């Protein structure tokens, strides 16, 4: 119940996720930023038996039927329930690059998701 | 099956992955370190229509039938094919923590996966 | 003028800094968290001719005359001036470890400093 | 003078460092990549009374007499002495950006410094 729902981050991107009983995360991500259009598939895992926040992570490869940014983002963080449910994350966005440019292929950031 | 196969990181953990034609990564991760025992389910996404490196990412929630570390790792990187194929990643390991310890809930590192 | 002053982060830690004309940052950091007591020396660099925020970074080795945590934090971010002056950062906290534990030696986080 | 010396990262950038008895790191960084030309001033801190690795960090603001990248890199890691001495780091490169591009202002990577 907790994780499953629609969330939004500070950028206004939309994350629709279903937490399966087997610890699977599935849904779609609708981004507000970058070189994206439409929704993108997400897949992740979460601690289906947490103790403390619930650790989770998910990945989006920024490719759908419309665009390809040749990049993928991974969000690693934790779900914290209560009145105000939130997912606090740190993310890595890696772009496919030639060997010469790989040193600067990864962006790091942080996103806070609020459940709607 | 560039990405599909068995890879090993510097630690000697085993990453068995199947890359779907659609951009899905699925498989098992057998760690050689941390508070784990057994194999863990992984899920990810990758650029199924790359340009030079192939962007990808995956998550492992550190819970199996045997144990629960109440944490999850996300790996973000790129697969580089050729004679000596590699997956160069950066990872984020977030532990489920109280709100008091949330500031130090996430570890960052890098992993190089090879087929040897 | 901008950078020089007293700042505080979300944890209530105190950062007292002087920006030199040569791009030098010097001051002391008074932490609210970890295994710290008293002030610690900080040293950093900043873009003394910015265009956009002003890029900067500083390091604190968590050792003073009272305690030693055998760890150092680096904050990398940017100063943004105006009504509400702020320093938005991402940080790395590395602990000295044996070779066996080096894989999990680095914490990553984010701090927002408000000028007082 | 374990740390004091000249080191090179995988890219071939040169790090000339002097470690003060007090925990200060001072020196010059000559990059072999990015938007730079010449040497850059670096400042950092390190654990002057280590336990097994020696925690340290430093910053370089990418501004010299010749150019200004309006960015700064912070390296956080540990020095490991012995026959084949190394400085294993993770770094954060933040560019001064508008508020609109701040979410993607920071790159993350890893550098291994050796004396060869
Ligand atoms: C516009 C589109 C979504 C496809 C796009 C997104 C992108 N990184 N996005 C993000 C990255 C990290 C955290 C959040 C987002 C976020 O979107 O909430 C990079 C290129 C790109 O084209
Ligand atoms: C032992 C067990 C697997 C459960 C476990 C693993 C763990 N992160 N491991 C890793 C993290 C980053 C990169 C590689 C691995 C790797 O293992 O290859 C953290 C806590 C923990 O308990
Ligand atoms: C208590 C003392 C400060 C010495 C201490 C601090 C510490 N990391 N601190 C931080 C780390 C990253 C960002 C901010 C802080 C911050 O303090 O604002 C780790 C061990 C420790 O003992
Ligand atoms: C070329 C010039 C030096 C100015 C420059 C450098 C730069 N980051 N470099 C690095 C970053 C991380 C680790 C090593 C280096 C290294 O150079 O060894 C980013 C933009 C830029 O313009």
Alpha-carbon distance A55 to D90, whole Å?
23
Count CA atoms closer than 13 A to B65's CA, side-chain side.
2
Ligand 1 contacts CB of residue A111 (under 6 A) = yes
- The 10 Å CB-count burial string (b at 16+, else e) for D60-91 is bbbbbeeebbbbbbbbbbbbbeeeebbbbbbb
- The experimental method behind these coordinates is X-ray
A58 is in an annotated binding site: no
Residues framing ligand 4 (Cβ under 6 A): D 9, 11, 13, 31, 33-36, 62, 69, 71, 73, 91, 93, 109, 111
State yes or no: D103 annotated in a binding site.
yes
The CA–CA distances, whole Å, from C70 to D23, D47, D91 equal 11, 6, 19
Residues of chain B with Cβ-Cβ distance to C104 below 8 Å are 34, 93, 107, 109
The pair of three-digit structure tokens given for residue D32, joined into one six-digit string? 């072999």
How buried is residue B89: exposed, middle or buried, by Cβ count under 10 Å (0-12/13-18/19+)? Answer: buried
- Tokens 């654990």: give the residue: D47
A100 DSSP assignment: T
Rounded to an integer, what distance in angstroms lies between the CA atom of residue A56 and that of residue B95? 9
CA D104, chain centre distance (Å): 21
Residue nearest to atom 22 of ligand 1 (CA): A35
Rg of the Cα atoms in chain D: 14
With CA atoms as reference, report the closest residue to B80 among C32, A66, A94: A94
Contacts of A102 in chain B (CB under 8 A): 53, 78, 88
Tell me the chain B residues in contact with residue D108 when contact means C-beta distances shorter than 8 Å: 90, 108
Closest ligand 3 atom, residue C11 Cα: 18
Judged by its nearest atom, the ligand closest to the C-alpha of residue C62 is: 3
For tokens 């790191």, name the residue: D25
Q: Is A75 annotated as a binding residue?
A: yes
Neighbours of C36 (CB within 10 A): 20
Q: CB of A30 within 8 A of CB of A55?
A: no
A69 lines ligand 1 (CB under 6 A): yes
Closest-CA residue to C25 (of C45, C7, C11, C39): C45
Q: Are D43 and D18 in contact (CB under 8 A)?
A: no
Task: Please tell me which chains touch C, using 3 or more CB pairs under 8 Å as the contact test.
Answer: A, B, D
Instruction: Provide the resolution (angstroms).
Output: 2.0
How many residues in chain A? 116
Taking CB atoms and an 8 Å limit, are B107 and C109 in contact across chains? Answer: no
Residue A66, CB-side half-sphere exposure with 13 Å CA sphere: 8
In the numeric block, the tokens 């040569």 are attached to C22
Atom of ligand 4 nearest to the CA of D11: 18
CA distance A44 to A28: 11
For A8, residues 6+ apart whose C-beta sits below 8 A from its C-beta are A14, A15, A113, A114, A116
Instruction: Measure CB to CB from residue B23 to each of A63, A94, A106 and give the nearest one.
Output: A63
3-state secondary structure of D103: helix
Residue among A59, A93, A109, D107 at smallest CA distance from B19: A59
Q: How far apart are CA A102 and CA A104, in angstroms?
A: 5
Question: Best residue in B93, B103, B111 to probe C by mutation, most C CBs within 10 Å?
Answer: B103
The CA-atom distances, in angstroms, between B54 and each of A15, A95, B110 are: 24, 8, 17
N-term to C-term CA, chain B:
16
DSSP-derived pairing of the beta strands B5-8 and C68-80? unpaired
Q: Are D62 and D37 in contact (CB under 8 A)?
A: no
Contacts of A104 in chain D (CB under 8 A): 34, 93, 107, 109
The pairs formed by A16-25 with CB atoms below 8 angstroms and a separation of 24 or more are A17/A42, A17/A44, A17/A58, A19/A46, A19/A48, A21/A48, A22/A48, A22/B41, A23/A47, A23/A48, A23/B41, A23/B61, A23/B63, A24/B41, A24/B43, A25/A56, A25/A58, A25/B43, A25/B59
Q: Please give the domain boundaries of chain B with CATH numbers for all domains.
A: 1-116 (2.40.128.30)
CB of residue A56 inside a 6 A radius of ligand 1 = no
Quote the distance between the C-alpha of residue C18 and its chain's center. Answer: 12
Pairing of strands D86-95, D106-114: antiparallel
Beta-carbon contacts of residue C100 (< 8 Å; ≥ 6 apart): none
Atom of ligand 2 nearest to the CA of B12: 18
> For residue C63, which of B101, D20, D45, D26 has the smallest C-alpha distance?
D45
For residue D111, how far is its CA from the centre of ligand 1 (angstroms)? 26
Cα B41 to its chain centre, rounded Å, is 10
How remote is the CA of residue C88 from the centroid of ligand 1, in Å?
Answer: 20
Q: Which residue has the tokens 């003060």?
A: D20
Q: What is the DSSP letter of D33?
A: S
B32: left (phi over 0), alpha (psi -120 to 50) or beta: alpha
């Amino acid at each position: 119940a907790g994780i499953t729902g629609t969330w939004y981050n500070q950028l206004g991107s939309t994350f629709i996720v279903t937490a399966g009983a087997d610890g699977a995360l599935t849904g779609t991500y609708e981004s507000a930023v970058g070189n994206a259009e439409s929704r993108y598939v997400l897949t992740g895992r979460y601690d289906s038996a947490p103790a403390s926040g619930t650790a989770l992570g998910w990945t989006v490869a920024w490719k759908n039927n419309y665009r390809n940014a040749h990049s993928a983002t991974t969000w690693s963080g934790q779900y914290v329930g209560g009145a105000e449910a939130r997912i606090n994350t740190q993310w890595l966005l890696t772009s496919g690059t030639t060997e010469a440019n790989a040193w600067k292929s990864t962006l790091v950031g942080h996103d806070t998701f609020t459940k709607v």
